[PDB]
Design a protein around this ligand. Structure first.
Ligand code: TSW
Length: 822
């Protein structure tokens, strides 16, 4: 009745969000993906295909120069005078990939240019006009006009009535339940900011009702020692059903009711909540007076607190905690102090999460002072504001304000943070929030964000508690996306469903059968591509028209992953090679890759390029997805065995020399290793990945090292080498059997990198904190964050930290560590 109304009110606000995004505005409705940029605080050759010319013009561009001027550098090559050529209309796209470079960004900024530079591959672009550019994903006029398909009052603070409700009954219990369990009981808890207000109240233990084995009837009144006036707005009642077995009691399912609804009215009368195991209806009867109780916020306190009495004596302790890594591990006496001297910290905005976490309580009286500070507070950094969207800050005024600061973030930065933002929706108790409107707004204005949100929300649906919420959010995204986007995403969904069929069919056969099974199973995929051309879900810029069945294969390892080879719909493009894996939960692989990618962004933003391999991985359902295949790369295992057949101190060295024969070619390959290895060693330690052996590490022919398996992750239960540097690796780093200055470089890079991540301890702890609700196996507790914080040693300075990591490296070498110098 009220939840149907909430859904109605949601849709109408989404209908008026759509108004800000007309189909005519190309800015927000391009119809194509924008090639991503990562601002990085140098010459390259680019090869541009131009309409009319038989050969593409190849010239050297300044990496620093903007795409706009490179477009008319290319126009200067064809036209002696570019005054009648309508320079504005022309754009630059990557050859093969239906992604357009951003005109007002440096060429060096673009991820594609960065990648090409790393691999030393050719930058192939195409100069064209947006007329010729494919805009099939663009929204239409139809899409714009289309609708979205997914009495007397007492104010709360006066209400002295006690929070009580009678748990009445659960309906529709299963046959295997009445079999197993003898009696059932509910545990009722009341929380705000994700923390209990009072200890949970347990119900009486009751069997199924007489002459009705589908029903459990308690009909018991539960009374909490709290008045209605003491309840914060975002108060939530949790009910967990337990069942004591016949002949510890087991948690059958959870339910959460918000005590205040979306129009600030206290829940009255009978409320039905549905817990999933199978749909069980649980009835809770709240009191039902002749009057509606509404929540009203505290009266606005208007103050501008300016110059104040200052002391030196305590200012030092103040700036000590201001410049603390995070609000994690902050003791009681530290909080009371900061809270007292909060108005002095007005010149350091990024420490507001530290201040709000130091608040004595969120009592109605103490809110006017909190809101007074908040609405005179300077803007936070988007990445800092993330903390305010976590569980421990449920207040709407905090969250709404966190999202307003968040609006300052770029699409390109947001795109890689979306998993955390999707999880953050679980801490929004109301469907229609500032956060969901923010996400939907960005999705409308950027097709990469919309595309990413789709897959993330579709994975989130599998949450038994929050699956209902995400259903409405994804319905809003798909509706608002338009027919163009929808029809394309449908094709992508069908492709993965087909690739999924063959994947499990392949694994379910014998050795002989496997190769024939694949060739036969792929016929149904061949059929798909004859009636449609599909964009690759992993990288939707690539459009596959046909499958190269003769090139398709399986990787002979334990899940028997597929090697799907599709031919590009663009002849200027290159063949599409992706792996489709089934069985393994690729979400923790996704997180590891994300964390490593963010480490890379941090490093690059401080001018440290460790030449990291950053490959994609997408979960396209439960325990299945596709992984980007890095070309001309093998595992250290295969390298070690193939060149142990032919010495046994230099198998990697002689592998790199095979593909890099000249002195300068081997030099650049050895150098690539040094940098990439340093980055891997740092990442291995900080994220705690102790399953790093010859199979789990991979090496590109260009010299770049990278991890592939992330089964062990946040496993900081290690006995006192985190990472391993074998004699093979050391030989490549040194360029010899005796230590050189190249090892000093490796050690310098490691420590320098380590420290740049230590500087962003807060970000990493926030990013890992927000992924705890995901259900990833290692990430289950805040304690699991402490392990990462301990690895980052925020207490120590860069001097001591360098000494620590340098001792990690000396330990890493192990037996052969004797040869090097302390
Ligand atoms: O050349 C390769 C590299 S093999 C690989 N690359 C990866 N790249 C990124 C992430 N994960 C992996 C990965 O798991 N493997 C397979 C690991 C393996 C190795 C030997 C036996 C069983 C399993 N791919 C191709 N590009 C074009 C054609 S083929």
């Amino acid at each position: 009745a009220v939840q149907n109304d909430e859904v109605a009110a949601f849709c109408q606000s989404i209908m008026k969000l759509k108004t800000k995004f007309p189909y005519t505005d190309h800015c927000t409705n391009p119809g194509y993906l924008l090639s991503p940029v990562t601002v990085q605080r140098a010459s390259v050759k680019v090869s541009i295909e131009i309409e009319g010319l038989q050969l593409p013009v190849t010239f050297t561009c300044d990496v620093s120069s903007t795409v706009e001027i490179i477009i008319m550098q290319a126009l200067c090559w064809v036209h002696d005078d570019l005054n009648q050529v309508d320079v504005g209309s022309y754009i630059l796209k990557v050859c093969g990939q239906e992604e357009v470079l951003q005109n007002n960004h440096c060429l060096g900024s673009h991820e594609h240019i960065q990648n090409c530079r790393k691999w030393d591959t050719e930058i192939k672009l195409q100069l064209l006009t947006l007329s010729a550019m494919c805009q099939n994903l663009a929204r239409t006029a139809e899409d714009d006009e289309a609708p979205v398909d997914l009495r007397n009052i007492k104010e709360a603070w006066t209400a002295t009535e006690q929070l009580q409700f009678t748990v009445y009954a659960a309906h529709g219990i299963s046959s295997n339940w009445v079999s197993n369990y003898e009696k059932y009981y509910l545990i009722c808890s009341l929380s705000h900011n994700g923390k209990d207000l009072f200890k949970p109240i347990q119900s009486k233990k009751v069997g199924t009702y007489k002459n009705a084995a589908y029903l459990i009837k308690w009909d018991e009144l539960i009374i909490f020692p709290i008045q209605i006036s003491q309840l914060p707005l975002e108060s939530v009642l949790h009910l967990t059903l337990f069942g004591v077995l016949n002949q510890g009691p087991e948690a059958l399912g959870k339910v959460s009711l918000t005590l205040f609804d979306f129009k600030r009215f206290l829940t009255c009368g009978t409320k039905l909540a549905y817990l999933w195991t199978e749909r069980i209806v649980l009835q809770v009867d709240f009191p039902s007076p002749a009057f509606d109780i509404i929540y009203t916020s505290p009266q606005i306190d208007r103050n501008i607190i300016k110059l104040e009495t200052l002391e030196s004596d305590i200012k030092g302790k103040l700036l000590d905690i201001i410049h603390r890594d995070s609000s994690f591990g902050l003791s009681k006496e530290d909080k009371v102090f900061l809270w007292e001297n909060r108005y002095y910290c007005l010149k350091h905005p990024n420490c507001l999460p530290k201040i709000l976490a130091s608040a004595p309580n969120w009592k109605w009286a103490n809110l006017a002072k909190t809101y007074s500070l908040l609405h005179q507070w300077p803007p936070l950094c988007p990445l800092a504001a993330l903390e305010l969207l976590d569980a421990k800050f449920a207040d709407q005024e905090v969250r709404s304000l966190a999202v307003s600061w968040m609006e300052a973030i770029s699409d390109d930065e947001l795109a890689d943070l979306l998993p955390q933002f999707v999880q953050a929706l679980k801490y929004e108790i109301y469907l229609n929030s500032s956060l969901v409107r923010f996400l939907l707004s960005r999705a409308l204005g950027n097709i990469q964000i919309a595309h990413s949100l789709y897959w993330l929300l579709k994975d989130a649906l599998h949450d038994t508690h929050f699956g209902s919420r995400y259903e409405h959010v994804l319905g809003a995204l798909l509706s608002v996306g338009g027919k163009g986007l929808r029809e394309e995403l449908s094709k992508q969904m069908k492709l993965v469903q087909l690739l999924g069929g063959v994947a499990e069919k392949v694994r379910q056969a014998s050795g002989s059968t496997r190769q024939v099974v694949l060739q036969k199973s792929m016929e149904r995929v061949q059929s798909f591509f004859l009636r449609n051309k599909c964009r690759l879900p992993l990288k939707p810029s690539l459009v596959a028209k046909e499958l190269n069945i003769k090139s398709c294969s399986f990787f002979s390892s334990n899940a028997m992953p597929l090697k799907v080879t599709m031919v590009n719909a663009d002849p200027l493009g290159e063949e599409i090679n992706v792996m489709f894996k089934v069985g393994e939960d690729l979400r923790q692989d996704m997180l590891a890759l994300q964390m490593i990618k963010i480490m890379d962004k941090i490093w690059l933003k401080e001018g440290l390029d460790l030449r990291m391999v950053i490959f994609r991985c997408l979960s396209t359902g439960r325990d299945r997805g596709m992984v980007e295949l890095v070309p001309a790369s093998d595992t250290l295992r295969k390298i070690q065995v193939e060149y142990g057949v032919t010495f046994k101190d230099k198998p990697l060295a002689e592998w790199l020399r095979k593909y890099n024969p000249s002195e300068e070619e081997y030099e650049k390959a050895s150098e690539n290793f040094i940098y990439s290895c340093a980055g891997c060693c740092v990442a291995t330690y900080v994220l705690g990945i102790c399953d790093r052996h010859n199979d789990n590490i991979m090496l590109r022919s260009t010299g770049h090292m990278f991890h592939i398996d992330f089964g062990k992750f946040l496993g900081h239960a290690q006995m006192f080498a985190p990472f391993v540097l074998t004699s093979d690796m050391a030989y490549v780093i040194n360029g010899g059997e005796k230590p050189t200055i190249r090892f000093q470089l490796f050690v310098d890079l490691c420590c320098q990198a380590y420290n740049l991540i230590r500087k962003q301890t807060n970000l990493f702890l926030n990013l890992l904190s927000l992924m705890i609700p995901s259900g990833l196996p290692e990430l289950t507790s805040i304690q699991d964050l402490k392990y990462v914080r301990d690895a980052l040693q925020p207490q120590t300075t860069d001097a001591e930290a360098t000494i620590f990591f340098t001792r990690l490296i000396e330990s890493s070498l192990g037996s052969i560590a004797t040869k090097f110098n302390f």
